Amino acid sequence: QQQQRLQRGLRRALDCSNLSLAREQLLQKKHMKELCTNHATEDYFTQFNTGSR
Amino acid sequence: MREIVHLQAGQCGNQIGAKFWEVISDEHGIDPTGTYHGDSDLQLERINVYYNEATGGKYVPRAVLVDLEPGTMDSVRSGPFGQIFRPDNFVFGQSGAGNNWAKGHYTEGAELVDSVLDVVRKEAESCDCLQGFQLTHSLGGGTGSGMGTLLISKIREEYPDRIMNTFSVVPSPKVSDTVVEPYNATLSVHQLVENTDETYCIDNEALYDICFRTLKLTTPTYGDLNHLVSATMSGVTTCLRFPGQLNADLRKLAVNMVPFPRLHFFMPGFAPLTSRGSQQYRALTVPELTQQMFDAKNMMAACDPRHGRYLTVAAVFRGRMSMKEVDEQMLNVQNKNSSYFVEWIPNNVKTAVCDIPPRGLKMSATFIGNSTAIQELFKRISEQFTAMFRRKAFLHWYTGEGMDEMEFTEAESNMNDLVSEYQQYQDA
Ligand SMILES: Nc1nc2c(ncn2[C@@H]2O[C@H](COP(=O)(O)OP(=O)(O)O)[C@@H](O)[C@H]2O)c(=O)[nH]1
């Protein structure tokens, strides 16, 4: 009976560590959304009409 | 390690090169006086593809700037970046070329050529492992076409394994500058097919409809057309300078788009081109760079591949991005349209991914694509040669310089089998 209670405790410790990693992986995918987004700054637009030939 | 010696010719070539070197020099963080004041360390490790060393952290390009009148490179020196070029690399004559290619193929340009070969063999043998060269010129001129096809021919007979590449500025077919542009442009193509094995087509009316209708400017200029010639041009050499997840040099571009050595005439394009007032409305993701790059409107040739047939395709991608969305859209454009893609080649598209975005952007994309829709470029230039030629119109300019009339007839006829080559890849 003692070993069965210890086994259940080990599985619940596994669950808690998985929960912490799930929150961190949510953070990682929320960061990874903002790299394939494109955005053009004002430097690219000041590249035009600089030479009046 | 993988050097590029950059060759320019003409008024086009001296004012395309002067703007392209404004693109690399701020890409690598080089100020107008030569030195480096960048912010990262990736802007310094592979800089020797284009720049050399000097004293005091000064980097000077491996360019040679060639012309046949001294007035063209007074503006190339008075530019914002005019004082970064080495003073010996400019080559100029005194008498002009006169929009007559044989003046610069036999008489004027044949005595300027042997002082440039003494220059290009000085900047080629300093390369530790030269990848190859690169030419930008106009077939419609006299210097870059009469003599620029002589400069190709004396570096392909001597260095016959390194790459020769050409960002040619072909005559626009609808509205163009000069009347006698057929002779200088038709005749140089037959002496262009042997000695390059990679060539693009940049028509100046295919740059006007982008910078007016797409970029939505008020007064376009030639300064806003050399931004599109150059942003393509750094976008085909960008894995040679910036590390990425799937590299591709300038040699592996050709290997997947020229399957027979007479098939090297592609059609460039460039995807993230948005108007400033219309920039807020745009969605900006991966499949709205593969959306706009494959429109026939975006294309930098004045010829459409709805009439023709995508023989092969390439694309180079910049920016940190996702290999699932890069690799599914390239599949997605290819599966839908069976009639625009050949048989006898299963997969037609090559992929390369760099990491460093262009200046002022996060992501970009560049296109190079082989077609048999570029023999509709050559039939419209070989209908207006032979219309003018069988009435012998402007002929005394050309056949009075020591040039036989049987020499016309070969590039009138044996050029035209290259036209008849491409329609036999309308069959299988
Ligand atoms: N697309 C483009 N065309 C140019 C540029 N500069 C000149 N041209 C075109 O090139 C032609 C003039 O070049 P040209 O002086 O005759 O060449 P060269 O004789 O070899 O010096 C004209 O048709 C112009 O429209 C440029 O920066 N971009």
Rounded Cα–Cα distance for residues B84 and B74 (Å): 14
Rounded Cα–Cα distance for residues B24 and B19 (Å): 9
Please give the sequence-ordered ranges of beta strands (E in DSSP) within B113-220, or none if there are none.
130-138, 166-169
Contact B224 A49 (CB under 8 A): yes
Place of tokens 């070029």: B85
CA angle B233, B34, B138 (to 5 degrees): 35
Nearest-CA residue for ligand 1 atom 2 is B204
Please give the sequence-ordered ranges of beta strands (E in DSSP) within B144-271, or none if there are none.
166-169, 269-270
**From the CB of B369, is ligand 1 less than 6 Å away?**
no
Mapped onto helix, strand or coil, the DSSP state of residue B307 is: coil
Rounded Cα–Cα distance for residues B119 and B13 (Å): 17
Q: In what helix (H) or strand (E) does residue B255 lie, and over which residues does it extend? A: helix B251-255
- HSE value, Cβ hemisphere, 13 Å, CA-based, for B426: 12
Residue B157's identity, in one-letter code, is E
Rounded Cα–Cα distance for residues A26 and A24 (Å): 5
Mapped onto helix, strand or coil, the DSSP state of residue B11 is: helix
Residue A31, min C-alpha distance to chain B (Å) = 13
Which of B233, B173, B260 has the alpha carbon at shortest distance from B19? B233
Task: Supply B366's token pair.
Answer: 């560049």
Q: What is the CA radius of gyration of chain B?
A: 21
Residue A20, min C-alpha distance to chain B (Å) = 26
All structural domains of chain B:
3-257 (3.40.50.1440), 265-374 (3.30.1330.20), 375-425 (1.10.287.600)
Which of B139, B351, B369, B164 has the alpha carbon at shortest distance from B270? B369
CA distances from B18 to B73, B75, B119, B141, B290 (A): 10, 9, 19, 18, 30
Q: What is the resolution of this structure in A?
A: 3.4
In terms of DSSP bridges, do strands B269-270 and B310-318 run parallel, antiparallel, or are they unpaired?
unpaired
**B319 → chain A, closest CA residue:** A36
Ligand 1 centroid to residue B354 C-alpha, Å: 32
A45 and chain B in contact, CB less than 8 A: yes
In contact, B271 and B367? CB cutoff 8 Å: yes
Task: Supply A12's token pair.
Answer: 């619940």
| Method by which this entry was solved | cryo-EM
Residues B79, B82, B87, B90, Cα dihedral to 10°:
-60
DSSP letter at B223 equals T
Number of neighbouring beta carbons within 10 Å of residue B95: 10
In contact, B132 and B240? CB cutoff 8 Å: no
**From the CB of B184, is ligand 1 less than 6 Å away?**
no
**Residue of A36, A43, A45, A53 to mutate, testing the B interface (most B Cβ within 10 Å of its Cβ):** A36
Rounded Cα–Cα distance for residues B7 and B13 (Å): 8
Residues B3, B7, B8, B9, Cα dihedral to 10°:
180
Which of B188, B113, B106 has the alpha carbon at shortest distance from B402? B106
In contact, B139 and B185? CB cutoff 8 Å: yes
Task: Supply B21's token pair.
Answer: 């070197």
Task: Supply B179's token pair.
Answer: 């009347």
DSSP letter at B211 equals I
In contact, B212 and B146? CB cutoff 8 Å: no
